[PDB]
Design a protein around this ligand. Sequence first.
Ligand code: CLA
Ligand code: CLA
Ligand code: CLA
Ligand SMILES: CC(/C=C/C=C(C)/C=C/[C@@]12O[C@]1(C)C[C@@H](O)CC2(C)C)=C\C=C\C=C(C)\C=C\C=C(C)\C=C\[C@@]12O[C@]1(C)C[C@@H](O)CC2(C)C
Ligand SMILES: CC1=C(/C=C/C(C)=C/C=C\C(C)=C/C=C/C=C(C)\C=C\C=C(C)\C=C\C2=C(C)CCCC2(C)C)C(C)(C)CCC1
Lengths: 105, 41, 197, 74, 64, 74, 165, 80, 226
Amino acid sequence: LIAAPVAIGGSTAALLALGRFVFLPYQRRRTDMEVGPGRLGPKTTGDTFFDRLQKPASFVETKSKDPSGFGLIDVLGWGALGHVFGYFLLACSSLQDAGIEPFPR
Amino acid sequence: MKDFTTYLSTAPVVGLGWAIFTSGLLIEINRFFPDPLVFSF
Amino acid sequence: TRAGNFAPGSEPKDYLEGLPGNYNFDPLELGKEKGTLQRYREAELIHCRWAMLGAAGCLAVEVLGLGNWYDAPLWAVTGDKPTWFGIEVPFDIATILGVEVVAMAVAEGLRNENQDMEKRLYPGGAFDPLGFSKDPKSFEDKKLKELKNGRLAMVACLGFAGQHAATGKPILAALGDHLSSPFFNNFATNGVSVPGL
Amino acid sequence: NFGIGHRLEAILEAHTPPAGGLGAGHKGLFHTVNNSLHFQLGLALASVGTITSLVAQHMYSLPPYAYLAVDFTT
Amino acid sequence: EIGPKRGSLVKVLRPESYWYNQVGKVVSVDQSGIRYPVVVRFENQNYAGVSTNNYALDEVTDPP
Amino acid sequence: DVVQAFGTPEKQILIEPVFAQWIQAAQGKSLYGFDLLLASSSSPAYSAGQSLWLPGWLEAINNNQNSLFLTIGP
Amino acid sequence: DIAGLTPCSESKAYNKLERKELKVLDKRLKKYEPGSAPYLALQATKERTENRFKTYAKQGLLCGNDGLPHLISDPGLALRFNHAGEVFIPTFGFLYVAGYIGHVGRQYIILSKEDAKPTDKEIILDVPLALKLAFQGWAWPLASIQELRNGSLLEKDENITVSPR
Amino acid sequence: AHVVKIYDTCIGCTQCVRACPLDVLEMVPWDGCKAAQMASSPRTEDCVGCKRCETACPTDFLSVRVYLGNESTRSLGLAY
Amino acid sequence: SMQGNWLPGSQTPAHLKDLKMAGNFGFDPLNLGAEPQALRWYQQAELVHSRTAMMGVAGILIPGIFTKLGALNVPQWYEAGKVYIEGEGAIPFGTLLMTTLFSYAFVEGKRWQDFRKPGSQAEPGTFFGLESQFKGTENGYPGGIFDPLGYSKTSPEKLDELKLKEIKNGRLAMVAFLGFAGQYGATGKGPIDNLADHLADPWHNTFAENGISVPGLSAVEQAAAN
Ligand code: CLA
Ligand code: CLA
Ligand code: CLA
Ligand SMILES: CC(/C=C/C=C(C)/C=C/[C@@]12O[C@]1(C)C[C@@H](O)CC2(C)C)=C\C=C\C=C(C)\C=C\C=C(C)\C=C\[C@@]12O[C@]1(C)C[C@@H](O)CC2(C)C
Ligand SMILES: CC1=C(/C=C/C(C)=C/C=C\C(C)=C/C=C/C=C(C)\C=C\C=C(C)\C=C\C2=C(C)CCCC2(C)C)C(C)(C)CCC1
């Protein structure tokens, strides 16, 4: 069945470690060619209340205290990936130990 | 005959001669041979 | 530096000049405008190595008589212990899946941040323990190599997959069949290789 | 507003095939779709009509409601 | 003098003209400095039924 | 229609829909006899999902009373 | 025996349709004397019906659940099974004549457009040149292929009337 | 009423003013054509949009253009 | 140059009046050879069709002649395929067809690359060093090991006389094989048996008496007999 705490924890630790030490240099390069200095950049320009909603948030650029660029939003996203992968593995184990074989024979 | 054969090279050479030839041709294939469905030579 | 011609008398294509393993291949002018040609080279130079590893694994499980390559990923089904080189592996299927999907992830991730084409193709340095790439003439000689045997490796992997797709037999047994009666045991005699036999 | 996500203009301008297969590709199409309300209306109506056709072709063969297949006229 | 030779075939590049990317024969080129001095004649009529039209100097080129 | 008018309905061109019948047999319809995947027990597509939804889908698609993938003629 | 269709020779509904046609044709035979021209015409019709039913059978023909012969359209399935004669060869048989007509029309169009006031040649046809092209169009695919290869088949858009969008 | 506009492609054949049975068009002196004439539409509000001037126009495309819209009691040809 | 005429009094095409060719008789009413490279490709196609027609027709005739003489029991060509298929020590049909297709694809790619680029098969160090003699003398006339008896490196007069003879026997063999196919299709017997029937009984054994060749002729003969 696989123990759900150890499976979820291992999956989210692996995903967070990947997102910090591995794909973080690959990340923000897509943003340099997406919303970079010479690219499209700002989504909106106007200065009314319905335009400040499209303006970027205030807690996403505060130079998070991690040595890398791993902010709170990246932590949430990679933890969501880890929870997704852990639940996928647990779901596959649940289908396996019920006597049902989804794989081709 | 020159004036007549200039007229005869207008619309009836393509509207009648081709029509009669292709028609009567196909009539005689459908007559001498019976109705086919499969091309088995 | 041209190795040869895939068709004797072909038109000389100028965008393939100087590349390692240079035949006058690519009829369809793929990667002619440079750019993706570098992507094509950096993708072929690792597809070759992966097919080399796979066909080496199949040949090692065959000629040492330790199993069949198609029957090798069958320990996950029916729940018996995995064996490598005869020795039983104490690991678990979930564990091996975890280490594989994180190890290949970190490998390709640190591979992806080279940011220079020459090291992306041929890293060297830490990827050169014995260091036979120091001599540039031997470097070009070994670059012409591993591509010929690499392309042959890719063709061999496709052949292994296709041979076990039609006839469910070990590849060594099929080789013995073609050695024994080649005119009776070939690709045209298995039935499902060409329609209409 | 957060730092992560995808930009539609970046995806549209990036998907330009090499060797001039589609010329400029989808370059300059984000402003064309956004500024023109009729483009969005036509796309929405195309998808809605196609999926209504899909709903019609999938309701009769796979009835999701109990005793719907018995009611022939319905 | 300032336009193509009289009687020479020219190609019309005017987009709104019926004879866009077509070949016409020059019949006269006006030398008084008017908006469309080049006068050409086409073997095929338009939908209005005319066969001649006037174009500027930049709207006519030699066909290949 | 003119062939049926002349009292000889066997002379009409009846092109059998081989493509869609082949597709239906690929989905598990055993009426046409094409022993393709999802209709043969040795195919990997039939084995994959053999215990998930295949006994329901095959039973529903091999029954001509329902409207699921009706038999189609010329 | 493909697509759940029985052969025409071993079909019960095919024979039922045949005997029904024979019965309705022999119904009209009782109202004429045997030595009459309508009787001879009806006998010829019955003989043609019997010949058609005989020739449609044992000719690689199948019919299913209706007694009416069916045609197999997918090539390959018409190759391994003896069904190419249904649509496979007659496809090229039609296409040869269609390319013949298109090629002789194209030849007449080019050979007329190079003539002074060429608009009259479409309403005033010439018979010797059209018949010469008519008996020169047997090798239409070779001529079309060589014209495509040398570029004279197509024309530069630069010289094609284009809508100004 | 409708909008009638004359472009510089006009060459002063002065037949668009004959084909208009409403005295919408007029011929003014010009210098951009050999005939030194140009169509002008002072009484544009009297036009109904019958496009007879466009029929009479020999230039390709049409030098005089009539655009429909904003119908009135005179542009609708109403005697009541 | 211009040798003979396929039809005396016919207007010979302008591309055949002053053209140096083997067996040029002015026979191109459809003007398929007006373009020069077109004529080169058609000449090569005629040469390969004619040469394989020599091989095929010789296989029809010489075993058939020896069977008529009683030397060998080799059957006629139309059932020889079934005879070998039903044999004991027989390579299967699929293997034979695929081997034939592979070898012919290889040699025809060689000939094709000779055609598009002349003498391009003589690229040094490409075919085991023996490709130095793979240079083509002319379209459809490669030479090299294809003339191992040295019967072509002489004066041009016997050379183009031999080319004319080759194209004549090749056209004859092509019409002969079309005849073999047709006279199996109609009579259902071997060509040697058909020749024996025509020699022993010419009037009652012909294409007209057989109803397959000209349908409706048998009905005409039966109506005229009654
Ligand atoms: C193995 C090599 C390879 C191959 C085969 C492809 C193949 C493709 N790439 Mg490409 N690509 C490659 C390598 C390759 N890529 C590499 C290495 C890179 C760099 C990383 C890219 C970067 C790249 C970009 C950036 C884009 C592509 C795109 C495409 C697609 C369209 C190509 C094109 O020009 O349109 C085909 C050429 C045409 C002229 C189009 C003609 C279409 C006709 C007119 C329509 C006919 C309609 C017809 C009536 C339909 C009938 C159907 C019936 C049911 C009615 C195509 C699937 C594009 C894509 O994603 O599109 C899917 C795209 O934007 N590629
Ligand atoms: C596009 C749709 C379509 C198609 C595919 C067909 C196809 C067919 N129909 Mg149908 N039909 C159609 C439309 C169509 N028809 C319409 C619109 C009508 C109403 C007017 C009919 C009415 C109709 C009737 C009433 C009958 C048919 C029949 C036929 C068959 C014709 C077979 C034949 O004559 O022998 C094959 C014919 C040929 C090979 C013709 C020869 C022409 C080629 C080019 C050879 C050239 C001749 C010659 C050798 C040239 C050289 C010499 C020359 C230079 C002088 C075939 C199954 C008949 C049949 O058999 O029923 C099954 C039949 O009884 N149809
Ligand atoms: C022989 C001359 C000729 C040729 C080569 C073509 C070729 C073409 N036409 Mg055109 N067409 C023609 C005559 C011709 N057409 C005539 C006379 C008409 C008026 C009825 C049309 C009406 C027409 C339409 C409305 C359309 C085409 C389309 C097409 C294309 C599809 C192929 C096809 O079969 O279309 C089908 C063609 C027809 C249904 C027309 C059949 C009319 C007969 C067969 C032509 C008779 C010409 C005559 C025999 C030539 C004289 C011979 C000479 C020896 C004296 C192709 C580019 C289609 C297209 O744009 O696709 C790209 C399309 O939508 N054509
Ligand atoms: C065939 C192939 C590539 C073919 C490419 C071709 C034809 C290219 C086509 C073109 O040239 C043309 C025609 C014409 C040109 O104009 C265009 C291009 C596009 C250039 C790659 C295979 C590539 C094959 C690869 C990478 C194989 C990898 C294998 C692995 C990893 C194996 C692992 C295992 O086998 C073990 C060891 C043991 C088992 O028990 C378990 C498993 C897991 C199965
Ligand atoms: C500070 C620090 C640290 C730590 C860290 C941490 C602790 C973090 C956090 C956290 C974590 C550790 C995690 C996170 C996560 C997040 C998120 C955000 C998640 C999410 C999830 C989800 C979203 C889910 C979903 C679902 C559901 C709901 C159900 C069903 C299934 C699914 C999956 C679908 C360390 C020591 C390392 C180092 C030093 C510093």
